[PDB]
Amino acid sequence: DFYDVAFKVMLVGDSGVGKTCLLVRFKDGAFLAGTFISTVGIDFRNKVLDVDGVKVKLQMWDTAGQAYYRDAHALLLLYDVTNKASFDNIQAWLTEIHEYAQHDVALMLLGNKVDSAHERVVKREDGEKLAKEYGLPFMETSAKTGLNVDLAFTAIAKELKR
């Protein structure tokens, strides 16, 4: 698959929030309810998307939640709607990104695991409100059901293209 433009996008957030699964879902269209394998170092995978008749390659970087920043064009920040601590830690992740990433990085906040599996503890409203407070786009997602996964990557690609 060829493309018109390419961007580097990195996923960040607490360990366990769903960074690896979210990427597997977008890239492979599947959710493997497999072994929880905590990511140790960063690694990348490519995917090409159509945006306004333009083909956009995303070079997507997974990262460990338990100098890269300065190279990224965009960062997806995830928390887990069923883990209040992951949401409480979002501002710290934002401070880090603001401190170490290019000043012109695109950002997006994702409240992941919005599905039957576990009980929500963070209301969508509270995530909407945090996003509004820092100017970031926001979406709820699920690697398990596929909720808004394609649409989140499409939106960031769209913002980068424009």
Ligand X SMILES: Nc1nc2c(ncn2[C@@H]2O[C@H](COP(=O)(O)OP(=O)(O)NP(=O)(O)O)[C@@H](O)[C@H]2O)c(=O)[nH]1
Q: Give the three-state DSSP class for 160.
A: helix
Q: Which of residues 5-64 bind ligand X (CB under 6 A)?
A: 15-21, 33, 36, 38-39, 64
Q: Does 112 carry a binding-site annotation? A: yes
Q: Does 63 carry a binding-site annotation? A: no
Look at residues 146, 123, 22 and name the one whose alpha carbon lies nearest to residue 77: 22
Among 90, 115, 127, 157, binds ligand X (CB under 6 A): 115
Q: Does 41 carry a binding-site annotation? A: no
Pairing outcome for strands 43-51 and 106-112? unpaired
Q: DSSP state, 14?
A: S
Among 112, 140, 152, 156, binds ligand X (CB under 6 A): 112
Look at residues 14, 21, 11 and name the one whose alpha carbon lies nearest to residue 44: 11
Task: Write out the residues near ligand X by the rule CB under 6 A.
Answer: 15-21, 33, 36, 38-39, 64-66, 112-113, 115, 117, 142-144
